[PDB]
């Protein structure tokens, strides 16, 4: 029995260290809203309350209506590296256990959830300025937990729960449990999750580090973005629309829908191409001896149904010895934005690379300039970095960024905009400009061209089934739903998804 | 801490899980090796020996080993190694690598799956084995990091709980590449002096192919990374040969890459023109006047609480130290220099307080392509008032500030070029001088006697000593050198001079 052996723990100052791991800001707080998207969330609601007296003069509110947190995936929550989303298949963007510690304390200094699931409605109120105030060299996390319908204790030890609602009561912006169970009731429906980020990122200045003053409908950086800064790296509404390949679920930034964007649906010729990046073609034999090793040391640790759980992962996984044998590079060009381009790279469902440049891309020049990539790279051929804005095995995610330039060129010389004249394509989508970074002219003709190339889709607010629209309104325009939806047989609500036809290419 | 019984409160743990998830910050393994050697110069080093061995028995063939002669460590200080975010090395006027008490443990996981440490002070030997095929065979979900110490002389344990160190050795005779006390031993006593560090990782990742994640055997005296080397490449990149040379921006350490030494270089002092930029950024004044408000105002916090008391006599020697924060770093030290020995090796080599944290982190004129800046190695003690590093020490923290401060060193980076004027003394003619006649910006200079000779006379050429490791500049033998061949032992520190520079 290894019990008393030396256990690495955590300490205050590696909470600091976990969120420098957060150069990108709004990645620190992509993150949490990863999390929202794993517990199937159908809305995540970012609005950020006003309260002057906590530092930053606001907090950083996370709203969502999914399938929350228990007590237990509560707890699971400051297990650094635990992620119960290890599983078949399942995009569930939680593989390493460590975003949301690492986003919100790269946020603020502080922070407190508000989960619900079921009949449970988890607190879990992070403060570092507590740590500060009081001398914590651990990292003290307070997990509270009361009834969703109640609102009523749900934990075992009641000095434990005392300590963590007084302390929640002292830094919190909430300094008691009647603005707390407000805080609970945001949640309309009987599952979801509130994370707040509190005593915010002073800058230099003494501003906090997120903006939500230069625009009420948006969390932005305090930080004047300068010109080249991207809007996903400006905008966490911008981050948050493009933060996923499938979003099933909207994002409602201070009381405002983000039109959310597959980003394969909403982009010129979305070709998909079906590659084995050359690697991944050893990676997919590798691929399934990884599912049938570990399914072996499945059945070791078995020696059931884990085993027979993750051996019908080895025959699925022989069957991805065609399906995930090859990966879907969903290559497509950004006609509403230019310069928002490169391989948006989706770690099963999630933007780890924004704006990577790969291919003909990485070297200057029009060369692929605006092919957006949406690949959904699944947890076995390549894996995120701690942050979640790199990937770890640098080895073969460079490999599959050359695999990318390869079928990136392919996809390149296969819609041959630029054999026709790629500065004439960007000029019929509004791009009449020198600068790259020159978002497209407003000009009537322009904007119809490029509604038009764009497959106009929407989710709806009820099914959240995404539609092909002949118009647009909205979901800041006007709001929309299926049963609206002009259209003969995409307008019920239990209608079946249109999901985007994808014109496949071929190499060589 | 406990105060009013936070022990019951659910405190936040890391799982073996976590170890991948750490290691995944270093996407950059020569960064994962770098956290070692970094920790071993906050050891004092003055050598690192890296020497690779042979062991097939093992996965990926060879364990990494980082054999030093520096202040090692003691029992407390390797459960320090364990406590992640814990580092000593946090002080006022720091010239440590230590801020975030994440390299070791970030690094030797990226590297390889498991790891075994040694470690010498005083009268103690400690090890810190931490092998993830133990987890991984056993099914361990809480990270577990063995802990046996041995003492220096006697080679006899020195551990509190002796079934706690069976089980240590146990699992180091299981999984690690060294059975028995025996082989342990020797692997400890590599550490020539009374005190030192040997950390080895083994049982590599492996590439994909089934290769370990290191190639040493393409190069014997060296540990390159396993994987081809394109034309844009770092050699830091691709040996960490190149990158412990260049690692420091103080190097008081030479590096034996297998038992052969690496000529570490001071980026400060080893280009064309350096010219040391005393800059306060726009902001460091202001930053450090809030880190002088910020420091000395939470000294008196904690001050206030210890008024206990080390704490508080430490608080006020860190207030006074804050109080001459105000005046002694107030500009950054900004040392610009054009390197000659490889231009396309350029981009600001960001150090921070004496570790590169941002290698090749092309700022300014050098972010627009072209042959703006192009060659300059920014060379910048960046203390820990203005930037701390990221999680894998090869970003910065705060982006915000980072970017205000990689805007600065624009700046001055073009002052720099126009103070040297050396694109108008042009910038082609002036690497055509200095071996380099291709368009190519890749391709490494001509070995020419007479161009080498004339990077020679440019560069003060600058070797360490091997016994007391005082650095020379010995008049215009490469691979080992002492003072006494130049210049004489007893001689002083001679810093070379670098013009200051001002801006506008
Ligand atoms: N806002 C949220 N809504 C719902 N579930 C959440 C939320 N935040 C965290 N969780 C859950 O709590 C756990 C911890 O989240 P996190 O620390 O992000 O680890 P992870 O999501 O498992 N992995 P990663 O996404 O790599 O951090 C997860 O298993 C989620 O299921
Ligand atoms: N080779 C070594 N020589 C001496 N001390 C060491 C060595 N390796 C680790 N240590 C000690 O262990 C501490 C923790 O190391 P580590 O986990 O790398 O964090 P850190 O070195 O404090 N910070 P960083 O490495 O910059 O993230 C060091 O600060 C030293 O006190
Ligand atoms: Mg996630
Ligand atoms: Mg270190
Ligand atoms: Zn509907
Ligand atoms: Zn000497």
Not at 456 to 479: A, E, G, V
Request: hydrophobic share 35%.
């Amino acid at each position: 029995n290894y019990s008393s052996l030396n256990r690495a723990q955590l300490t205050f100052e590696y909470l600091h260290t976990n969120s420098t791991t957060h150069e990108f800001l709004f990645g620190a707080l992509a993150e949490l809203v990863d999390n929202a998207r794993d517990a199937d969330a159908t809305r995540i609601d970012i609005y950020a309350e006003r309260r002057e007296d906590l530092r930053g003069g606001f907090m950083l509110c996370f709203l969502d209506d999914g399938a929350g947190m228990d007590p237990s995936d509560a707890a699971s929550v400051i297990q650094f590296g635990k992620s119960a989303k290890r599983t078949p298949e399942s995009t569930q963007i939680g593989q390493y256990g460590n975003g949301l510690k690492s986003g919100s304390m790269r946020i603020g200094k502080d922070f407190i959830l508000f989960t619900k699931k079921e009949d449970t409605m988890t607190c879990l109120f992070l403060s570092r300025t507590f740590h500060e105030e009081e001398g914590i060299d651990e990292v003290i996390v307070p997990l509270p937990t009361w009834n969703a319908r109640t609102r009523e204790p749900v934990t075992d030890n009641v000095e434990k729960f005392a300590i963590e609602t007084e302390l929640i009561y002292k830094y919190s912006p909430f300094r008691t449990e009647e603005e707390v169970m407000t805080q609970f009731m945001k949640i309309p429906g009987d599952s979801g999750t509130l994370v707040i980020i509190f005593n915010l990122k002073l800058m230099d200045n003494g501003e906090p580090e997120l903006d939500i003053i230069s625009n009420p409908r948006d969390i932005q950086m305090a930080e004047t973005s300068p010109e080249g800064t991207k809007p996903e790296r400006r905008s966490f509404r911008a981050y948050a629309a493009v933060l996923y390949i499938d979003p099933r679920m909207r994002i409602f930034i201070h009381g405002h829908k983000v039109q959310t964007k597959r980003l394969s649906c909403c982009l010129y010729k979305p070709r998909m191409y079906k590659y084995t990046s050359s690697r991944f073609k050893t990676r997919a034999e590798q691929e399934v001896k990884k599912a049938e090793h570990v399914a072996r040391i499945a059945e070791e640790k078995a020696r059931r149904r884990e085993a027979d759980v993750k051996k019908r992962i080895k025959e699925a996984k022989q069957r991805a010895l065609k399906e995930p044998k090859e990966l879907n590079f969903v290559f497509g060009v950004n006609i509403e934005h230019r310069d928002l381009d490169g391989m948006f790279i989706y770690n099963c469902s999630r933007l780890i690379k924004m704006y990577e440049k790969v291919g003909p891309q990485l070297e200057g020049g029009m060369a692929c300039g605006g092919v957006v990539g949406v690949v959904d790279v699944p947890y076995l051929v390549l894996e995120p970095t701690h942050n979640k804005q790199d990937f770890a095995d640098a080895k073969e995610y460079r490999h599959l960024l050359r695999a990318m330039g390869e079928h990136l060129a392919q996809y390149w010389k296969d819609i041959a905009i630029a054999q026709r004249g790629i500065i004439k394509f960007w000029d019929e989508f509004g791009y009449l400009s020198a600068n790259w970074n020159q978002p497209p002219s407003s000009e009537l003709r322009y904007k119809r061209r490029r509604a038009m190339e764009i497959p106009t889709t929407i989710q709806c607010d009820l099914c959240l089934k995404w539609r092909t629209l002949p118009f647009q309104l909205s979901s800041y325009p006007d709001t929309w739903v299926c049963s609206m939806n002009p259209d003969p047989e995409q307008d019920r609500c239990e209608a079946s998804e249109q999901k985007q036809k994808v014109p496949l290419g071929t190499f060589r």
